[PDB]
Design an enzyme around this catalytic site. Sequence first.
Site, PDB file in Angstrom:
ATOM      1  N   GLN D 154      82.557  20.288  35.976  1.00 24.42           N
ATOM      2  CA  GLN D 154      82.734  20.452  34.530  1.00 24.42           C
ATOM      3  C   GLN D 154      83.563  21.676  34.114  1.00 24.42           C
ATOM      4  OE1 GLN D 154      78.204  18.875  33.297  1.00 24.42           O
ATOM      5  NE2 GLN D 154      79.554  19.718  31.703  1.00 24.42           N
ATOM      6  N   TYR D 346      43.401  44.827  56.808  1.00 26.43           N
ATOM      7  CA  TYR D 346      42.939  43.564  57.385  1.00 26.43           C
ATOM      8  C   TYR D 346      44.098  42.930  58.143  1.00 26.43           C
ATOM      9  CZ  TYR D 346      38.357  42.912  54.997  1.00 26.43           C
ATOM     10  OH  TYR D 346      37.050  43.006  54.556  1.00 26.43           O
ATOM     11  N   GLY D 463      31.590  37.356  54.275  1.00 27.88           N
ATOM     12  CA  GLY D 463      31.961  35.907  54.421  1.00 27.88           C
ATOM     13  C   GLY D 463      33.031  35.740  55.484  1.00 27.88           C
ATOM     14  N   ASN D 499      39.586  33.058  53.768  1.00 23.83           N
ATOM     15  CA  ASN D 499      39.336  34.355  54.401  1.00 23.83           C
ATOM     16  C   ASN D 499      40.438  35.007  55.252  1.00 23.83           C
ATOM     17  OD1 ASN D 499      36.345  32.638  54.801  1.00 23.83           O
ATOM     18  ND2 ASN D 499      36.538  34.268  53.261  1.00 23.83           N
TER      19      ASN D 499
HETATM   20  C1  M43 Z   1      40.645  47.254  58.404  1.00 21.61           C
HETATM   21  S1  M43 Z   1      39.057  46.492  58.077  1.00 21.61           S
HETATM   22  C2  M43 Z   1      38.734  46.908  56.387  1.00 21.61           C
HETATM   23  C3  M43 Z   1      39.842  46.395  55.508  1.00 21.61           C
HETATM   24  C4  M43 Z   1      39.555  46.867  54.024  1.00 21.61           C
HETATM   25  C5  M43 Z   1      38.149  46.594  53.620  1.00 21.61           C
HETATM   26  N1  M43 Z   1      38.139  45.960  52.382  1.00 21.61           N
HETATM   27 NI1  M43 Z   1      36.391  45.559  51.169  1.00 21.61          NI
HETATM   28  N2  M43 Z   1      37.435  45.328  49.427  1.00 21.61           N
HETATM   29  C6  M43 Z   1      38.868  45.281  49.482  1.00 21.61           C
HETATM   30  C7  M43 Z   1      39.520  44.879  50.795  1.00 21.61           C
HETATM   31  C8  M43 Z   1      39.317  46.064  51.702  1.00 21.61           C
HETATM   32  C9  M43 Z   1      40.395  46.256  52.930  1.00 21.61           C
HETATM   33  C10 M43 Z   1      41.631  47.013  52.567  1.00 21.61           C
HETATM   34  C11 M43 Z   1      42.745  46.809  53.562  1.00 21.61           C
HETATM   35  O1  M43 Z   1      43.521  47.751  53.877  1.00 21.61           O
HETATM   36  O2  M43 Z   1      42.857  45.687  54.108  1.00 21.61           O
HETATM   37  C12 M43 Z   1      39.671  45.629  48.232  1.00 21.61           C
HETATM   38  C13 M43 Z   1      40.726  46.873  48.559  1.00 21.61           C
HETATM   39  C14 M43 Z   1      39.882  44.393  47.158  1.00 21.61           C
HETATM   40  C15 M43 Z   1      40.642  44.769  45.902  1.00 21.61           C
HETATM   41  N3  M43 Z   1      39.965  44.664  44.638  1.00 21.61           N
HETATM   42  O3  M43 Z   1      41.826  45.155  45.908  1.00 21.61           O
HETATM   43  C16 M43 Z   1      38.419  46.407  47.544  1.00 21.61           C
HETATM   44  C17 M43 Z   1      38.172  47.944  47.605  1.00 21.61           C
HETATM   45  C18 M43 Z   1      39.145  48.807  46.838  1.00 21.61           C
HETATM   46  C19 M43 Z   1      38.523  49.945  46.100  1.00 21.61           C
HETATM   47  O4  M43 Z   1      37.905  50.842  46.729  1.00 21.61           O
HETATM   48  O5  M43 Z   1      38.628  50.001  44.847  1.00 21.61           O
HETATM   49  C20 M43 Z   1      37.095  45.562  48.052  1.00 21.61           C
HETATM   50  C21 M43 Z   1      35.687  46.144  47.856  1.00 21.61           C
HETATM   51  C22 M43 Z   1      34.652  45.189  48.486  1.00 21.61           C
HETATM   52  N4  M43 Z   1      34.962  43.882  47.918  1.00 21.61           N
HETATM   53  C23 M43 Z   1      33.755  43.322  47.636  1.00 21.61           C
HETATM   54  O6  M43 Z   1      33.671  42.204  47.145  1.00 21.61           O
HETATM   55  C24 M43 Z   1      32.619  44.068  47.900  1.00 21.61           C
HETATM   56  C25 M43 Z   1      33.137  45.451  48.043  1.00 21.61           C
HETATM   57  C26 M43 Z   1      32.945  46.173  46.794  1.00 21.61           C
HETATM   58  C27 M43 Z   1      32.561  46.356  49.238  1.00 21.61           C
HETATM   59  C28 M43 Z   1      32.433  47.861  49.047  1.00 21.61           C
HETATM   60  C29 M43 Z   1      32.257  48.656  50.321  1.00 21.61           C
HETATM   61  C30 M43 Z   1      31.792  50.052  50.125  1.00 21.61           C
HETATM   62  O7  M43 Z   1      30.877  50.283  49.282  1.00 21.61           O
HETATM   63  O8  M43 Z   1      32.315  50.984  50.781  1.00 21.61           O
HETATM   64  C31 M43 Z   1      33.499  46.088  50.359  1.00 21.61           C
HETATM   65  N5  M43 Z   1      34.582  45.333  49.924  1.00 21.61           N
HETATM   66  C32 M43 Z   1      33.025  45.952  51.793  1.00 21.61           C
HETATM   67  C33 M43 Z   1      33.901  46.030  52.887  1.00 21.61           C
HETATM   68  C34 M43 Z   1      33.323  46.160  54.251  1.00 21.61           C
HETATM   69  C35 M43 Z   1      32.647  44.924  54.770  1.00 21.61           C
HETATM   70  C36 M43 Z   1      32.022  45.132  56.109  1.00 21.61           C
HETATM   71  O9  M43 Z   1      31.128  46.012  56.200  1.00 21.61           O
HETATM   72  O10 M43 Z   1      32.411  44.499  57.133  1.00 21.61           O
HETATM   73  C37 M43 Z   1      34.589  46.693  55.040  1.00 21.61           C
HETATM   74  C38 M43 Z   1      34.670  48.183  55.296  1.00 21.61           C
HETATM   75  C39 M43 Z   1      33.681  48.790  56.278  1.00 21.61           C
HETATM   76  C40 M43 Z   1      33.870  50.260  56.563  1.00 21.61           C
HETATM   77  O11 M43 Z   1      33.093  50.817  57.376  1.00 21.61           O
HETATM   78  O12 M43 Z   1      34.812  50.912  55.994  1.00 21.61           O
HETATM   79  C41 M43 Z   1      35.687  46.176  54.172  1.00 21.61           C
HETATM   80  C42 M43 Z   1      37.052  46.278  54.593  1.00 21.61           C
HETATM   81  C43 M43 Z   1      37.370  46.384  56.025  1.00 21.61           C
HETATM   82  O13 M43 Z   1      36.585  46.076  56.906  1.00 21.61           O
HETATM   83  N6  M43 Z   1      35.344  45.968  52.797  1.00 21.61           N
HETATM   84  C1  LIG Z   2      36.681  30.572  45.900  1.00 23.33           C
HETATM   85  C2  LIG Z   2      37.695  30.383  44.776  1.00 23.33           C
HETATM   86  O1  LIG Z   2      37.262  31.114  43.621  1.00 23.33           O
HETATM   87  P1  LIG Z   2      36.480  30.444  42.369  1.00 23.33           P
HETATM   88  O2  LIG Z   2      35.109  30.127  42.897  1.00 23.33           O
HETATM   89  O3  LIG Z   2      37.238  29.200  41.963  1.00 23.33           O
HETATM   90  O4  LIG Z   2      36.530  31.540  41.342  1.00 23.33           O
HETATM   91  C3  LIG Z   2      39.096  30.843  45.209  1.00 23.33           C
HETATM   92  N1  LIG Z   2      39.121  32.240  45.613  1.00 23.33           N
HETATM   93  C4  LIG Z   2      39.678  32.568  46.901  1.00 23.33           C
HETATM   94  O5  LIG Z   2      39.020  31.774  47.886  1.00 23.33           O
HETATM   95  C5  LIG Z   2      39.621  34.047  47.276  1.00 23.33           C
HETATM   96  C6  LIG Z   2      40.403  34.243  48.585  1.00 23.33           C
HETATM   97  C7  LIG Z   2      41.000  35.640  48.737  1.00 23.33           C
HETATM   98  C8  LIG Z   2      39.964  36.741  48.524  1.00 23.33           C
HETATM   99  C9  LIG Z   2      38.894  36.768  49.630  1.00 23.33           C
HETATM  100  C10 LIG Z   2      39.476  37.374  50.907  1.00 23.33           C
HETATM  101  S1  LIG Z   2      38.325  37.264  52.293  1.00 23.33           S
HETATM  102  C11 LIG Z   2      40.056  30.561  44.083  1.00 23.33           C
HETATM  103  O6  LIG Z   2      40.299  31.455  43.237  1.00 23.33           O
HETATM  104  O7  LIG Z   2      40.561  29.419  44.016  1.00 23.33           O
HETATM  105  O1  LIG Z   3      32.217  41.327  50.301  1.00 25.44           O
HETATM  106  S1  LIG Z   3      32.375  42.098  51.555  1.00 25.44           S
HETATM  107  O2  LIG Z   3      31.667  43.386  51.387  1.00 25.44           O
HETATM  108  O3  LIG Z   3      31.775  41.315  52.654  1.00 25.44           O
HETATM  109  C1  LIG Z   3      33.939  42.396  52.086  1.00 25.44           C
HETATM  110  C2  LIG Z   3      35.053  42.013  51.139  1.00 25.44           C
HETATM  111  S2  LIG Z   3      36.375  43.176  51.517  1.00 25.44           S
HETATM  112  O1  LIG Z   4      73.398  13.151  33.668  1.00 25.76           O
HETATM  113  S1  LIG Z   4      74.038  13.344  32.346  1.00 25.76           S
HETATM  114  O2  LIG Z   4      75.469  12.976  32.460  1.00 25.76           O
HETATM  115  O3  LIG Z   4      73.358  12.464  31.375  1.00 25.76           O
HETATM  116  C1  LIG Z   4      73.911  14.910  31.762  1.00 25.76           C
HETATM  117  C2  LIG Z   4      73.326  15.905  32.757  1.00 25.76           C
HETATM  118  S2  LIG Z   4      73.920  17.527  32.231  1.00 25.76           S
END
Ligand code: M43
Ligand SMILES: C[C@@H](OP(=O)(O)O)[C@H](NC(=O)CCCCCCS)C(=O)O
Ligand SMILES: O=S(=O)(O)CCS
Ligand SMILES: O=S(=O)(O)CCS
Lengths: 431, 48, 278, 578, 578
Positions: D154, D346, D463, D499
Site C-alpha cells: 500500500q 528459590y 506447600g 510451586n
Molecule cells: C533460597 S530458599 C528461600 C527463598 C525465599 C523464601 N521465601 Ni518465603 N516469601 C517470599 C519468597 C521468599 C524467597 C525469596 C527468594 O529469593 O527466592 C516472598 C519474598 C513473596 C513476596 N510477597 O514477594 C515473601 C517475603 C518478602 C518479605 O520479607 O516481605 C514471602 C513470605 C512468606 N510467604 C508466605 O506466604 C508466608 C511467609 C510470610 C513466611 C515468612 C517467613 C518468616 O517469618 O521469616 C515465609 N514466606 C516462609 C518461608 C520459609 C519456608 C520454610 O521454612 O521452608 C523460607 C525461609 C526459611 C529461612 O530459614 O530463611 C522461605 C523462603 C526460602 O526458603 N519463605
Molecule cells: C492457587 C491460585 O490462586 P487462587 O486460589 O485462584 O487465588 C493461583 N495462584 C498460584 O498458584 C500461585 C503460584 C505462585 C506463588 C506460589 C509459589 S510456591 C492463581 O492465582 O491462579
Molecule cells: O508459605 S510458606 O511459609 O510455606 C513459604 C512461601 S515462600
Molecule cells: O482486507 S481488506 O482489504 O478488507 C482491508 C484490510 S486493511
Amino acid sequence: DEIDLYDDKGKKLAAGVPLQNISPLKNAAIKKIVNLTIRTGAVDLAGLEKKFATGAIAGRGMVIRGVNRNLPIVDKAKEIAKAVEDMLRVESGDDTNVELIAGGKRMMVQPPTARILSDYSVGLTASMGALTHAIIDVCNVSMWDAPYVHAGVWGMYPQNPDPGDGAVKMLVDIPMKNEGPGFTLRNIPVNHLAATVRKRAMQGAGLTMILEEAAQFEMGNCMGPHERGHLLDLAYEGLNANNLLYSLIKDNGQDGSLGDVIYAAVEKAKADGVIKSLKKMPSGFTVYDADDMQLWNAYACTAMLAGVCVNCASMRAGQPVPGNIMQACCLIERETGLPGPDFGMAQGASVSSSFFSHSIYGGGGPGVFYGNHIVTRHAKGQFIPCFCAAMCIDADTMYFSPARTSALYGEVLGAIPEFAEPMRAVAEAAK
Amino acid sequence: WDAPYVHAGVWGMYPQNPDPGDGAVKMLVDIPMKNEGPGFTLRNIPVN
Amino acid sequence: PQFTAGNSHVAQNRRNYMDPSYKLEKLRDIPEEDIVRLLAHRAPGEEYKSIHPPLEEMEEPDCAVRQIVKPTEGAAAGDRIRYVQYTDSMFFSPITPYQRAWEALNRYKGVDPGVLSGRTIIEARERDIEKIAKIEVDCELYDTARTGLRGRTVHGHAVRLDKDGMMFDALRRWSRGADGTVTYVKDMIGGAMDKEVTLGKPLSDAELLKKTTMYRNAQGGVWQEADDPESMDVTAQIHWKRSVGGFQPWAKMKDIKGGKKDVGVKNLKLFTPRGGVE
Amino acid sequence: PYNDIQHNFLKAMSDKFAEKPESTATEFYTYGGIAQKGGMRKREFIAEASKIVDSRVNSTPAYNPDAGMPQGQRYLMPYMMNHTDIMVNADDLHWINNAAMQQAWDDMKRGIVLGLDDAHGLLEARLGKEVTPDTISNYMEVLNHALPGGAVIQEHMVETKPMLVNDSYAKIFSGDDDLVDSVDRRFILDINKEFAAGYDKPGEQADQLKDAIGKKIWQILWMPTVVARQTDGGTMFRWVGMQVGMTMINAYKLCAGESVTGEFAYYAKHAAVVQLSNYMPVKRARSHNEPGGMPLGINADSTRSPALFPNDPIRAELESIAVAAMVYDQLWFGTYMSGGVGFTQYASATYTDNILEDFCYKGCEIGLDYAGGKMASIKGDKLNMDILEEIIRAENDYALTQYEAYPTVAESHFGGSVRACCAAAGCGSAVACATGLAQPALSAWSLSMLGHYERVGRLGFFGYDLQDQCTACGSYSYQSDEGMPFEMRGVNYPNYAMNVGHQSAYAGLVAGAHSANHDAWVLSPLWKVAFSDRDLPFDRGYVTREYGLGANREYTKVAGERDLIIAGHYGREPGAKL
Amino acid sequence: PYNDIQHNFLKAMSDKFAEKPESTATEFYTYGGIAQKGGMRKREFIAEASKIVDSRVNSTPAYNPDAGMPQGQRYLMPYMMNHTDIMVNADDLHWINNAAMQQAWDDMKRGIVLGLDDAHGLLEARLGKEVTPDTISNYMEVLNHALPGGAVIQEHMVETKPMLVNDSYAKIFSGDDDLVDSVDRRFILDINKEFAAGYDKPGEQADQLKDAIGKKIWQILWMPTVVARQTDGGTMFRWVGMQVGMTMINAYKLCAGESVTGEFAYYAKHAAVVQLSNYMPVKRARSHNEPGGMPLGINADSTRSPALFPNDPIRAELESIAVAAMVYDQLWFGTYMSGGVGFTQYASATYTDNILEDFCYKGCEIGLDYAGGKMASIKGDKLNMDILEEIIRAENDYALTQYEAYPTVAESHFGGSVRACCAAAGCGSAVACATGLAQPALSAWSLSMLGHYERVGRLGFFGYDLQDQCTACGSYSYQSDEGMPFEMRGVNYPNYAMNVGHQSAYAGLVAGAHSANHDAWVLSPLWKVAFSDRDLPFDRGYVTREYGLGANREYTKVAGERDLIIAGHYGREPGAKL
Ligand code: M43
Ligand SMILES: C[C@@H](OP(=O)(O)O)[C@H](NC(=O)CCCCCCS)C(=O)O
Ligand SMILES: O=S(=O)(O)CCS
Ligand SMILES: O=S(=O)(O)CCS
Ligand SMILES: [Ca+2]
Ligand SMILES: [Cl-]
C-alpha cells in the site's frame, strides 16, 4: 463385592448391597442428585429489583447513571414466577419447577430435563433467558429499556465470559471455567455444599463425594479395573459402608486425637484381614501388604475422613482439615509401610491446600476450595469431601464462611430432599 | 514403565495442553473450554 | 502402635515423641503468664476474646459429628484461634518439623499444625494453644540454643551457629548470659515485653546427639544408610507401592516387570565418608 | 564434594565465606546491617528512594527498610554463577535488576516456527504457480523487510523505526541439503553448520535432525522484543500470519486480497504453525507463547549445550536448569502468578555456587557406576526397581550429606525447598545417566523427596511437596490428567501448576536423559534448530555467563529499549549534569 | 466545517496541503518519492537498516523499501493532533515509534483497585484487632515500601532497584470525609480535590462520587511498568494480593503465615478486588487486565476531561476516543490480534486533523437544536424513533458532505473505513447531547452506516460493517449474547470482537452521553477516581497533547526503561563516539 450401608447415627440402612448398586452410572439417587445439581437455579428477586432501581446492573464497583428504572418484580413476583415456569415447560406434567420463597423475595428455578440436549449449562441459560423475557413482558418494559434487563439478569456477559454478576445462581459454573473435560460436577464451592446440607458434616461429605466420584467417571478415570477402587472409596468413605466411618468417629470423639483414629483404622484393617504381615524389620517393625490394594485404599480414605471429623469437631473449626489430611496419610503410611490414600495424591493435595490456606499466595480457608480448584483437584475424588465436612463442622470461626458466602443456597436448595439426605436417598435406590 | 507413552499417544498433549486434539479420538464437537459460551456445544463443529 | 520404622536411637526418639503413653522429660518450668507474654496475642490478666458465643448458649446444627465429638475447652468458650511457632536448628534440634506434627496430632485434641523447613506452626483455640505452648517450651522438645520461638522472621535453621552454639535470630529475641543461660528479651514476633523471660541453659552436644530425631551424617550424628538401613528400606517400600498403585491400583508388586525382589536392596553403596568431610 | 573443583562447590564456598567450607560456626550482628559489602545495593536503593519521594505530588514514600525488614544481621552473601568464575551481588539476580534474564525470556516468547511447504502446495494447487529456490530467496528478502513493520503493497503506510525493531528477522531451515544450497545463504539457518556435533563421528546431530525434519522447509520468525513487552505472547503467531500474508502477496504476484489470501491466512495461523506453547485454563488465563503452556522439553531444546558440549550431559542439565529456574520460578511463579519481591533465590540456588552442579556431576558418576560404566545401558530388561533404588539411595545420601557436612552449603541454600530441589535433581541425574530415559527420573525424584523428609525431619516450604507426594503415583499413571511423559509436562500438568523449586530441576533431568542417550533434542527438532540461531541477542549456549554479565551491568545485548525516541524518563528531571 | 476553528478541520487542512481546503485537484509523481519532507523518517530508517545488516552474522537484510512498496508517489501528509496546534510526522504515530502511546496503555494495564473494608472486618471478626486511622496510615506506609518490591518480613531478601520501579505506589480514596481527614495525607487520593468540578455549584462531581462510594475505603495500586512489559496483565491482581498480604502481616502483627493470612489472600485476590478486565474465550486467549476484556465505559472513565472541562461533552468524547483509538485499534487489533505495520491511521484518523473533532462538535450543535437547546432533554416520553431519525439524517448529511465538498478532508481520511467511523461518531454525538443516554447512540450508529453505504455507494474495508449491520438488531435486543447496555460492551461483545474503526468512536459516544447527562462517570466511580491520580506518568487529562510530544520525541515521562543496568544495546557496538 458387597457392603452394608449405614446412616450418620450408626444405624444400618441396607445389607448385602452389591458394590455396583451405588455406582454413579447405575444408582437412580445419584443420577437424580446430578440432574438436580445442573438444573436448579436460585434467584434473589429483591436484590435484582434493587439492581434495576439503582443502575447497579453491571460488575463489581460499577454503576450506570440515568438508567435507573423501577420494576416491581417482587410485587409482581407471582406473575413473573408463572411466566418463567410456562416458558421453561416443554410438555405438561414434565419436571419443570418454579417456586417462590420468602414472600417472593427469592425464587427457585428448575428448567425441565428435556431442555438439556447436549449442554448442562442450559440449566443456567434457560433460566436466564426465561427470567429476562418474564420481567420485560410482565413489567411491560419498552424496547428502549430492554437492554438494562439483560444486564440485570446476565451480568457482564457476553463482554465477560462469566455471567456470574447476573441473577441466576447455580451450584455449577459455566463450561469455560471447568479445568478439563468431565470436570463439570467438580466446579462447586465447598461453602455452597456446606450451606446446602445445612451444615451437617456427614451429609456434606456424602453429597460432595457423590458429586466427586460422578465427576471421576466423567473424567474417564473409571474405565476397566480402575472402576472398582473408586466404587470402594465412595461406598466406604462417602456412604459409611459397614459403619467403619461412623464407628471410627464415635469411638474416638470424646478424647481421641487424629492419630488415635488412624491407629484404630490400622487395627481394624488387620482384624478384618485387609492387610497382613509382609516382612519383619530388624527393629521389630512390620511392613504390611494387602492382597486387595483397592480395599485397603478404601479403608485408608475412611480413616482420613474420620480423622478430619474428630479433630475439626474438637476445635469446632474448619481450618485444620488440610494439615489433618496430611498427617492422616503420612502417619498411616509410617504405621504400616503401605501407601496412603489415593497412593500419595491425597497427601499431595493436603500439602498444597495447607499452603494455600495459610499463606499470601492464593486459596483461602477450606470453604473457598472445590474439586475443580487447581489447588485441590489432584486426588481422585476422596479429598474434597473432607473439606465440606470441615466447613459444616466450623462454628463460624472463619470470615469466608457458608453463612457469609452461600446463604442463598442454604435457603433455596436446603429443602431439596436428595440434597438434605443424600445417603438415605442412595441407600433407598440401591435396594 | 511404558504406560505413559500410551497416554501421550491417545490423549495428546493433555493435560499440559488443555486441548487433547493431538490425541487419537476424533469427535465432531470440541472440549468445553473452547466453546464461546454456555449452550455453544453443538456449534463447535467445523463446516468441512 | 508401631509409629515409625527404624532401628537406631534416633528412630526410637521419633517413636517416643509420637507416643502419648511416653512422658516427655521436663527441662524447665515457664510460668503461664510468661508464656502469655511470649506469645503476645494478649496481655496476662486480659480476658479471652470470643469469636462466637460459648457453644452451650447456642443451638448448633443438628450434626451427628458435633453430637459425638466433644469440643475442647477453648472451642466451648468460643476462643479466638491463635498460634505458637518454633524454628528448629539443623544442628541437632531435639525435635524436627515433621516430627512436631506427628507429635502434635497424636498427643493433642483439636489442633492445626503446619510443617515447613524453618518454621512449624500450631494453631488452636487460644486457651488450648497457651497450654500446648507451655508443655512444648517446658519439655525436652525445646532446647534454648537449637530451638526458637518465632512467629516471624524465622531465618536461621540452616545457618551456621554462633561462637556459643546459638542459632541465628535476625530479631535478636534472645540474650545469653555469661553462664550460658538464655533469656527472651522480646516476644515471639520481636515485640517489646514488660519483662524478660528466662528460659534456661542449652543442652550439651552429647545430650543433643542423644535426644535428636534427625539423621545427620556430620559432627557425629547418625548416618542413616550406614547405621539404620531399615529407615530407607521401609520408606522406599512406601515409594514403590505408591508407584505401582498409580499405574494400576489393584496390582501387586509381584505382578510388575522389574518389581522389587524384596524390601531393601542388596547392593547399596555409599559415596561419602562418615562425617562427610573430605 | 565432587572431585573436580570445576564442578564442585568448594571454590564458591571458599570465596563467599571467611571461614572454611566445613566450618560449623560464624559470627552475627557485627556487620553493621547494610554497612557491609553485601549491603551495597540496599544503600544504593536508599539513596534513590529519596529522589522518588521528592518527585511525587504528595510525597508518597517509597523504598524504606525501616518500614519493612532491615537487612544484614547476618552475612549478606554474594553468589558464583555455576561453571564460571563470576561473582554477583544477590540483589543483582532479581529479574528486574538483570536485563540479561529479561532478554532470555523475551527471546523465547517472540519466536514462532512456520512450515513453508504447505504454502508452496497451495500456490501449486490453486494457481499452478512455480516455486523455485530463486522465488523462495525473493520471498525471504521481502519477508525480512515486512516482518519488523515495513510496507510491501500500500501507498501512504507508516512504518516502524528499524533500530526499535532490529532484533526481528526471519530465516529458513530444512533437511533438504540441495534446497539449502540453492537458496540465498543470507536467509539460511544451517543445520549442518550449527549441528556438526557428533558422538562417534562429525555431523551425527545434524543427521538426526535432518532425518527427523526430512525434506521439509521451515521458517523461524522472531518478532520485535518491544512487541513482546508492549503486548503478550498471543501476538506472535498472529504477527507471523500478517507479514507472511503480505509477503506471499508480493513475492508471488497475487491479487492483494483474494480467496487464496484467505487460505494463506489459515495455513499461516493454524495449518502449519508451530508455537512455543498453547493457552491456559482460565483461572490462570494467559495468551499463547507464555511460560504456563511451555513444555519442559522445549525449555531444554532452547539451550545449545548439547550441540556445543555433546559429551557433557550434566552441563546440558545445568544450562537447561538455569533457563528454567529463571523462566518458571522467577518470572512465571514469581511474577505472572504472584509478584512482589518474588522468588530470586528459590531460582538462583539451582544456578549458583556450583552446589546443584556438584550434586548432578556426582549423580552422573554414581549412575554410571551402577550402569557398569556404560552410559544409558539401563533400559529394557535391565531396568528394574532394585537397581533404581540402589542408585537413588546412594546419590541421595551423597547430596544430603554435603549440606550437613559442609554447613556453608546449607547456609547458602538456607531454605529447605532448594536443598530438596537439588538433592532430588542429583538423584534424577544419576538415573538419567544410567538409563538415558526420562520417565524413571521421576522415580528418583519421588524417592529422593520421601527419603529427604525421612532423613532430615523436614523438607521445603508449606506447600513444597504437593507434586512430590504425587510423583510416585503420577510416575507411570495413564489416567486422564494424572499421567504423561516427563518431556511433555510443564506448569499446566495439574500438580506442577503452583510451586517453585521443581521446574528448574525438571528441565535439567529431561535434558540429561536425552544427552546421556545421545539424542540431539528432547522434544522438538524444530525448536532445537530455531534456538541455535546465532543472531539472537541472548547467548543460549552460555546461560549462566549471560546471567552474570546482566548482574554486573556489563550486558550489552538487551533489545527493545526506547532511548532513541524520548527526551527523558518518568521521575527523572531533564537538564545537564553539573 | 464547524464555525469555530478551535474545533473545525480548517487549520489542519490549511497547514497540511498547499492548495485550498476545498481544492479538488493536486499534483502527483513529482515529490521524488521519500525525497519530500514527509519522507524524512523513511530516509532515516534506510540509513539505520544498513547498520542493522552489518551486525548480522550472515548479513540477513532488513528494512528495504525497494523490496516492498516504495512510498510517496503522492504527497506524504503530516497530521495535526486534535485540539492542539501540534504537527506530527505520520510515521511518529506508530505505537512502536511513540513512547507516550506505550505509557498510556501501560498505565491502564498495571492498575488494580482493592477494597480495604473487608480486611478491617476480617481483623475484627477473627482477631478483635483494632483498626484506627493511625494503623491505616502505618499500613499504607509499609505498603508503599513493599509494593514495588521491598522486603517487610524475611532476612536475606533480594529487592528491586527503586528507580526501575519508581512508578509503583499505592493510595487510598474514600467517600468518608472524616476518615480522609484522619489519615496521613501522603497516602490520600482526595476526591474533594480531584473532583471540585460541578455544574451548578463547586464539588458536585465529588458529591456524586462520594455518595456512590459511601463510607468505604478503596485502594488504588499501580504496579511497575516493567512488570507489565516483562509479563502480562494477569500479574496485576496477583501482585496486589502478594504485597497487601505481606503488608497486613506486618501492620497488624500477625503470624507471618497463619490461617488468617490465607483468608486475607482470598480477600485481596477475589472478594474485594476490582480489575480493569477479565480474561477472554480461548481462541483469543488473554490474561486479565488486557484490552480485550476492558469495557468501553472503563476506557472513558480513565480520561480526566469530564473533571477538567465539566461543560464540554465533546472534548470528553474526543479525549476518550484518542485513548480508545490507540488502545483498541493500534494495540489490541493492530498488534495483540494481528501485528506488522498495523493500524496507525485507522486509529489516528479519529484523533488528528480536527476532522472527527469538527463532526462531533457540529453533531452536538444539531442534537441541541433538536433538543430545543436543552441538553439531554430527549428522554422518557420524549424519546421516539422520529426525532432520532431526524437528528441522525441531519448530522449524517453534514458530516458526509464535508468529505465531498472539502476533498482534502477525504484525502486525509483516504480509506472509507475512517470516514464511516467519523460520520457515525458525529451522528452518535448528536443523539448523545440530545438525550444524555448511551443506548440510543446505537440507533444513530446503525442509521449512519446504512445511510452512508446508501449515499456514497461505498463504506469501509472488506469486513468493516460486521457490527454495523448487526447494530440495529443488537440495539435493544435482550437475547443471550446479543444484547448489552452500550457502556458495558467491549471487544468481547461478539460482533465487536474483530474490527478497527469502531471502538475508538464507541468510547467517545459512551463518554458523550454521560457528560451531557452531567454524570461524573460512565461505568465505574472507582476507576474514575483512580485514574485521576496526578502521579501517573501519562497525562490522562490531555491525551492528544501527550501523543504529540511522543511523536516529536519530546516526551519525558516514559517508565520501565533499563538504561540504569546495561552497558550497551543489541545491534549497537560500545565504545566512545568520535
Ligand atoms: C533460597 S530458599 C528461600 C527463598 C525465599 C523464601 N521465601 Ni518465603 N516469601 C517470599 C519468597 C521468599 C524467597 C525469596 C527468594 O529469593 O527466592 C516472598 C519474598 C513473596 C513476596 N510477597 O514477594 C515473601 C517475603 C518478602 C518479605 O520479607 O516481605 C514471602 C513470605 C512468606 N510467604 C508466605 O506466604 C508466608 C511467609 C510470610 C513466611 C515468612 C517467613 C518468616 O517469618 O521469616 C515465609 N514466606 C516462609 C518461608 C520459609 C519456608 C520454610 O521454612 O521452608 C523460607 C525461609 C526459611 C529461612 O530459614 O530463611 C522461605 C523462603 C526460602 O526458603 N519463605
Ligand atoms: C492457587 C491460585 O490462586 P487462587 O486460589 O485462584 O487465588 C493461583 N495462584 C498460584 O498458584 C500461585 C503460584 C505462585 C506463588 C506460589 C509459589 S510456591 C492463581 O492465582 O491462579
Ligand atoms: O508459605 S510458606 O511459609 O510455606 C513459604 C512461601 S515462600
Ligand atoms: O482486507 S481488506 O482489504 O478488507 C482491508 C484490510 S486493511
Ligand atoms: Ca508484556
Ligand atoms: Cl516461498
